Design a protein around this ligand. Sequence first.
Ligand SMILES: C[C@H]1CNC(=O)c2cnn3ccc(nc23)N[C@H](C)c2cc(F)ccc2O1
Length: 297
Amino acid sequence: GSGIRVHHIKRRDIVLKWELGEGAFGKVFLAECHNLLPEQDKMLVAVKALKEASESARQDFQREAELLTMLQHQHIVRFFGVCTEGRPLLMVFEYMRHRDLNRFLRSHGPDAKLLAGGEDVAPGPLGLGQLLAVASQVAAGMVYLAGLHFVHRDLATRNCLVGQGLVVKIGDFGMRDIYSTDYYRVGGRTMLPIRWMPPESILYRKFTTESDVWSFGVVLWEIFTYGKQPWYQLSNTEAIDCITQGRELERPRACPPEVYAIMRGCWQREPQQRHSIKDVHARLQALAQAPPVYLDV
Ligand SMILES: C[C@H]1CNC(=O)c2cnn3ccc(nc23)N[C@H](C)c2cc(F)ccc2O1
C-alpha cells in the first residue's frame, strides 16, 4: 500500500552497451537511457542488474529502491529509478566516469604500473587539496546519512564512486560486491569488512553512527595511502587482534599530521569519546580550503 514512489523506467529506453563490473547481487553495465529527463534526450547511465529474482530478492529490491529514492544528496550517487517489467530486475544511476574511488586512488598512486589518463586530472599523485576534497566529500555524505539515523555497515573507498571534475559520491550502501580480502567469512552469507570495523562491532556486534565515524577514519587512511588495504601484511585474525587491543594504523607517508590527528580521533575505543561526523567534516572542509605544507623526511 503506502510508500515512496520510485520512478519506473521502460526497458525500451535502456540499451546496455557493455559490462562495467560484477557482484554477488548481480552485474553492473554501462547503458544509454532515452527521454530519462527532458534536459538530455539520450544519455549514459550505470545499471545494476539482479542475478536471482525470487520474491525474497524482489522484497529486498523494493526496500532498496524505496530507501535509495529517499536518500538524495550532493554526495550520494544519483538514483534515477528501477525497471521491474521483465527479469532481470534493474536499478539505474548516473554514470560516474572515474569508477569506484578505490581503483581511482590506486591509479594515481606511486606503485601504479601504468600512468592514468583523463582530461579532468593530472596523471600520478594527486594534490593534498585534492585528497582533502575527496575526504571532505565522503564525510559530507556521511553527515547526511547520520542526519537520517542511517547506518552504513561497509563504508570503504570501494563503495564510493568518482565522477568528472573529481566529484566523490557514496555509491553502494552494501545491503553486494562478491568477496575480496577486505571481508572475513564468519558464516554462510555473513561476511564482515572487519578491517573497517571498530571494537564495539567485533566485540558486542553493535553498529551506530559512531561506528561509521570509526570506519570513515579507515577511509581517510585508504585515501592517504592511494587505496592500500588496512593491515595488508596481517590476516583477518591478526587485524581483529589489532583493532581489539587498541593497535592503530601508522600515519601514511603522504598524510599531514593535522589529518592523522583527525584519523586518531575517529579511532577512540569509547564511541562517545569519538568526534562527531559533523566535526570531522568541518576540519576537512577547512583544511581543503587552505591545504597546509608537507614534505617527506
Ligand atoms: C561494478 C562497480 C563499478 N561501477 C561503475 O564503474 C560505475 C560507474 N558509475 N556508476 C554508478 C553506479 C554504480 N557503478 C557505477 N553502482 C555500483 C553498484 C557501484 C557502486 C560503488 F560504490 C562502487 C562500485 C560499483 O560498481
